[PDB]
């Protein structure tokens, strides 16, 4: 019924894993800092109208446990009626928070909702929360659990993406994220993180390597850190994809998403709710869709989810101006581009997680807020945001500029 609009979409810079600037910053502080910025932009807002705060978080333990969304509401001095719920749909948790918020606004039972995500991967490494699919042998043996880095290599093998191919995309992502920063694109949306004394802690995306060359990317070694180098998983993958003889391991640390810290926030409301608060709508949520594909390859989820959200909105690829897919691995983006036949100049036009990093819980809300800015800057109409998800899920969203 009611149409759901986006009124604000900000994010923190992404601090790197090794000697990161955000390592001393609790993930609760990352979110409170973004709430304080929303207040600065609208000090006249009636915060009593905000009825929920929905935050994605893939590792809700320790500094990120205990419903961190509600902690943000209380720690920021927001009204006690503002709710606060945490959710975890792996890498899409940020965009699922936004989608769920949009769906709650459409139902008419919520008026003005805050959505986003937070993931301090240097303080709470991925896997800190455990899990049945990984740590219980009965179900691990059944679902054929395989680390995502191996599904990405398998995708490159089946599709025939070479090491030079995935390295070529990695270079593009670096150059486009660099051009976006130096062009002032992110100037209004990236909220610098400061300490309790006002001192600057971080104001840019540390993980970026702007002076990357194709010769340097080729010197890198294929992934050999964590579960990927444990053993057995390549054979497990080939038992299902039995027509493949050997996996070509092409993904390194230079063509995969980086491990970083960050947080993002999006303010979503109905037209009546924004008009009552003096807010100007920036974009409209047109349709959402969740779907999935095989959980052993794990990273083919974007295609059926993007296909599903295009039918619900009555649209085709020709109708979409910008395609934003999370750059978890280069082959996932190249597989997606090959399936739907996406033009190069429409795909991740401002660089992606390979350049700027992938803070699991927040990434969906970050690339969503990235598309809101680029549509307004280019004066374009539509954008489609999607992410590959662990376990073979997919989530996609179509936003329209207002």
């Amino acid at each position: 019924s009611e149409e759901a609009f986006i009124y604000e979409a900000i994010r923190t810079p992404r601090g790197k894993q090794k000697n990161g600037s955000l390592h001393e910053v609790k993930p609760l502080s990352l979110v409170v800092g973004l709430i304080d910025e929303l207040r600065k932009r609208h000090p006249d807002l009636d915060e009593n109208l905000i009825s929920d705060v929905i935050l994605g978080c893939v590792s809700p333990v320790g500094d990120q446990g205990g419903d961190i969304a509600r902690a943000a509401v209380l720690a920021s001095g927001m009204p006690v009626t503002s709710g606060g719920v945490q959710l975890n749909r792996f890498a899409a948790s940020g965009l699922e928070a936004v989608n769920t918020a949009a769906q709650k606004v459409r139902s008419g039972w919520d008026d003005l909702v805050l959505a986003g995500g937070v993931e301090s991967m240097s303080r709470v490494p991925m896997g800190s929360d455990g899990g049945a699919m990984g740590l219980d042998p009965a179900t691990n043996y059944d679902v054929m659990f395989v680390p995502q880095s191996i599904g990405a290599d398998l995708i490159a093998t089946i599709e025939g993406f070479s090491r030079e191919d995935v390295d070529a995309y990695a270079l593009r992502s670096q150059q486009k994220a660099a051009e976006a920063w130096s062009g002032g694109y992110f100037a209004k949306s990236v909220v610098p993180v400061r300490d309790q004394n006002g001192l600057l802690i971080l104001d840019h995306d540390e993980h970026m390597r702007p002076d990357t060359t194709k010769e340097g990317l080729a010197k890198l070694k294929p992934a050999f850190e964590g579960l990927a180098a444990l053993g057995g998983f390549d054979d497990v993958a080939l038992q299902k994809y039995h027509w493949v003889e050997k996996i070509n391991h092409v993904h390194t640390g230079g063509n995969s998403s980086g491990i970083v810290d960050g947080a993002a926030l999006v303010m979503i409301g109905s037209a009546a709710a924004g008009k009552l608060q003096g807010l100007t709508p920036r974009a409209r949520i047109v349709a959402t869709a969740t779907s999935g594909a095989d959980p052993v390859i794990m990273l083919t989820g974007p295609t059926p989810a993007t296909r599903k959200v295009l039918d619900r909105a009555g649209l085709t690829v020709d109708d979409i101006d910008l395609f934003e897919l999370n750059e978890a691995f280069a082959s996932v983006v190249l597989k997606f581009q090959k399936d739907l036949n996406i033009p190069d100049e429409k795909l991740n036009v401002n660089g992606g997680a390979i350049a700027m990093g992938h803070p699991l819980g927040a990434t969906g809300a970050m690339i969503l807020g990235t598309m809101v800015d680029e549509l307004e800057r280019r004066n374009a109409r539509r954008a489609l945001i999607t992410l590959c998800i662990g376990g073979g899920m997919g989530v996609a969203t179509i936003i329209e500029r207002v």
Binding site: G127, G130, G134, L135, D136, P137, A138, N140, Y141, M144, F145, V146, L227, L230, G231, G232, F233, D235, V236, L238, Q239, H242, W243, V244, E245, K246
Partner: protein, 724 residues
């Protein structure tokens, strides 16, 4: 609850309380020669454990001992094999009662010592693991382990739970539980499975009571308390919640799936699940979780397949089931091996290993010497790995005598010919040594395809000519196929039978027919793979199908070992008899195509795989264009079933024709000779134990066969003897 089953049987346990208060439970089942975890034992231990509680005030220690030559070995397999899915309640309550007895014995408040005198296998080791101290006698023939996984089961008497508490999740699974390893007393103490050793079985009970007297004096508070029952117990390697173990825990099912190659063997999966799920809870909840997984295995079909094959069938064979009755034993003094190829050299090694004096003859002394070098390289491998001493390795090689003169076969009373596959060559090779060997010398032949009756006409003592078929590598293949020609006496059969057991291998007695049983059946397995390759199926999918079916080696790799030039000879040979008009297998076209291209197998240097330097290195890339691979993409289960059914159906033909005389020979012969998957219980058991979407049983086998026959050819039609 109760230490008993219900709410009749004989008494198994002997009670003895001494003046110091030590009770000596001596197990002595009067219905057999071995203590077995049967219904009589459960009742006898129930009464014994009730008494330990009732007389607790006058008891200071317990010593569990045995009166047989072995300590305690195995469970009641005659009953576990009849457990239907509806019987799951009874199977659960039985193992729960067995473990409630051991738990009471273990938390008695006083030290319990196991006096292990012989083999403590299966449930027997589960008894000793429930004691606080284990003393073993370092004697010959003594083994300790938990080999339930080899029967498709798991240690349901606390073996999974206690070994995990003792060694951790990873060490217990890999070294004890997953493969059911058996340990000698010296090795058992080293890994921590036994606490101390003694020289003779007479010292066990005295040493046991001495340890109790000392433990009560030196450790008054910790006496009769297991490490996992103390406060502040730390599991070795951590619990599943420990960050160190959590990091590698996701790779345990993937490593296990890599070792099993995707085969549908449910028991190792269940052992790993029971192991980990148990470490997350207390000891009693862990023991109950293990019970439920045990009941899951017993009421399933694979366990019935493996219980049938690796317990009943294997026992019937070792007990001389195929050995003729009334024939006595005959010693072997000097073995004479003709031909120093990989077969003859392997035959010379396994015979010298058993203690026999071997004369290894070839056509040149250079050739015979290279044949003994096979035994030298093998002994240098075992000497480097510490599995033998320098003295026994020197005595082994000294028993092998290479030669090139026919006169050096003097004193040989057991000839094993292993020369080239050709009739008139074998006729000439036997004709020049048959007069030098002893007058009662066995004249064995290691042919794979040629009928034994034909080869027998080349000797004058045809009653002693017999087929002795080995499988390469002889040092690691456990089967010997003994072919009975229509002139071979029952004495020649029993002599080769006894020779087979003496060298540590399992025999099957097979009537003379072209292809015998192993060559004929493994042919149909390989021919199915080549047919699929001709049909356009991807070569990697064929190999995955062979491994996921449960074969030790995938079929295309196996063809390279067998070499296609041999396979093409078999096709011309079995056709020259049909002459009628021959009905060729679809695989015959693929063999001739590869021979035309000069890719005959590993011996040539090129086959379905590429061979760079010495080792195999990936499938031949030109294979996909030759046979247009990828054009036919059947379901993986159809590929798997085509290979299993072809052999299963061919085995039934051998049983009908009289090639085999028992399904035990069929099951063990297929498992140990040609590598049929163990979870099937053998290529004969596969029929009665087939389980798929169409159901379970022989009727389900016939339906699946007819479904396969409709889609892939009439060679899958079931024989009349499998029908109603």
């Amino acid at each position: 609850s109760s230490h008993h089953h219900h709410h009749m049987p004989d008494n198994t346990i002997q009670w003895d309380k001494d003046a110091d208060g030590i009770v000596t439970l001596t197990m002595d089942d009067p219905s057999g020669s071995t203590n077995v975890m049967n219904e009589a034992y459960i009742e006898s231990m129930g009464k014994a454990v009730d008494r330990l509680v009732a007389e607790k005030d006058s008891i200071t220690g317990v010593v569990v001992a045995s009166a047989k030559k072995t300590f305690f070995a195995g469970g009641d397999v005659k009953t576990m094999i009849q457990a239907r899915p509806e019987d799951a309640g009874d199977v659960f309550n039985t193992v729960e009662t067995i473990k409630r007895q051991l738990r009471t014995l273990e938390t008695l408040g006083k030290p319990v010592v196991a006096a292990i005198n012989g083999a403590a296998l299966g449930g027997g080791l589960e008894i000793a693991l429930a004691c606080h101290h284990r003393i073993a006698a370092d004697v010959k023939g003594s083994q300790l382990g938990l080999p339930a996984v080899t029967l498709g089961l798991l240690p349901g008497g606390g073996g999974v739970t206690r070994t995990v508490r003792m060694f951790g999740i990873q060490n217990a699974f890999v070294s004890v539980l997953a493969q059911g390893t058996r340990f000698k007393p010296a090795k058992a103490k080293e890994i921590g499975l036994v606490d101390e050793l003694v020289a003779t079985v007479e010292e066990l009970v005295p040493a046991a009571k001495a340890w109790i007297k000392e433990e009560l004096k030196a450790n008054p508070d910790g006496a009769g308390v297991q490490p996992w029952d103390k406060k502040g117990y730390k599991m070795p390697g951590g619990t599943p919640s420990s960050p160190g173990l959590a990091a590698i825990l996701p790779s345990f099912p993937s490593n296990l799936r890599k070792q099993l190659k995707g085969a549908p063997m449910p028991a190792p999966r269940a052992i790993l699940a029971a192991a980990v799920e148990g470490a997350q809870v207390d000891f009693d909840t862990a023991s109950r979780i293990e019970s439920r997984y045990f009941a899951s295995l017993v009421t399933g079909q694979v366990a019935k397949n493996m219980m049938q094959a690796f317990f009943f069938d294997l026992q019937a064979i070792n007990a001389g089931g195929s050995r003729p009755e009334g024939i006595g034993k005959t010693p072997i003094k000097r073995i004479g091996v003709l031909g120093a190829g990989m077969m003859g050299a392997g035959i010379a090694y396994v015979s010298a290993k058993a203690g026999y004096e071997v004369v290894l003859k070839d056509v040149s002394l250079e050739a015979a010497a290279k044949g003994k070098g096979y035994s030298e390289k093998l002994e240098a491998k075992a000497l480097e790995r510490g599995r033998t001493t320098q003295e026994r390795s020197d005595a082994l090689l000294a028993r092998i005598t290479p030669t090139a003169d026919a006169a050096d076969f003097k004193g040989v009373d057991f000839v094993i010919e292993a020369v080239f596959e050709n009739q008139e060559l074998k006729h000439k090779v036997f004709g020049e040594i048959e007069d030098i060997v002893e007058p009662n010398a066995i004249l064995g032949s290691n042919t794979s395809t040629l009928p034994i009756t034909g080869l027998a006409t080349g000797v004058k003592r045809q009653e002693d000519f017999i087929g002795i078929h080995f499988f390469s590598p002889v040092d690691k293949m456990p089967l010997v196929e003994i072919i009975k020609g229509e002139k071979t006496s029952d004495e020649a059969l029993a002599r080769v039978f006894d020779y087979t057991l003496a060298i540590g291998k399992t025999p099957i007695v097979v009537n003379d027919s072209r292809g015998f049983f192993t060559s004929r059946v493994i042919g149909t397995f390989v021919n199915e793979a080549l047919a699929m390759l001709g049909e356009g199926v991807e070569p990697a999918s064929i190999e995955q199908a062979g491994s996921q079916a449960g074969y030790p080696a995938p079929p295309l790799q196996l063809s390279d070992e067998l070499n296609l030039e041999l396979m093409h000879k078999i096709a011309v040979a079995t056709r020259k008899g049909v002459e009628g008009t021959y009905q060729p297998h679809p695989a015959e076209a693929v063999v001739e195509k590869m021979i035309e291209l000069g890719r005959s197998g590993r011996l040539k240097g090129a086959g379905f795989y590429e061979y760079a330097d010495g080792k195999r290195s990936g499938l031949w890339p030109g294979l996909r264009e030759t046979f247009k691979s990828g054009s036919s993409q059947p379901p993986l289960q159809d590929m798997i079933d085509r290979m299993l059914f072809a052999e299963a159906l061919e085995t039934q033909k051998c049983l009908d024709e009289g090639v085999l005389t028992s399904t035990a020979d069929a099951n063990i012969g297929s498992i140990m000779g040609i590598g049929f998957p163990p979870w099937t219980g053998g290529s004969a058991q596969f029929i009665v134990g087939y389980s798929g979407p169409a159901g379970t049983g022989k009727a389900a086998f016939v339906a699946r066969a007819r479904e396969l026959a409709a889609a892939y050819g009439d060679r899958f039609l079931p024989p009349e003897s499998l029908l109603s």
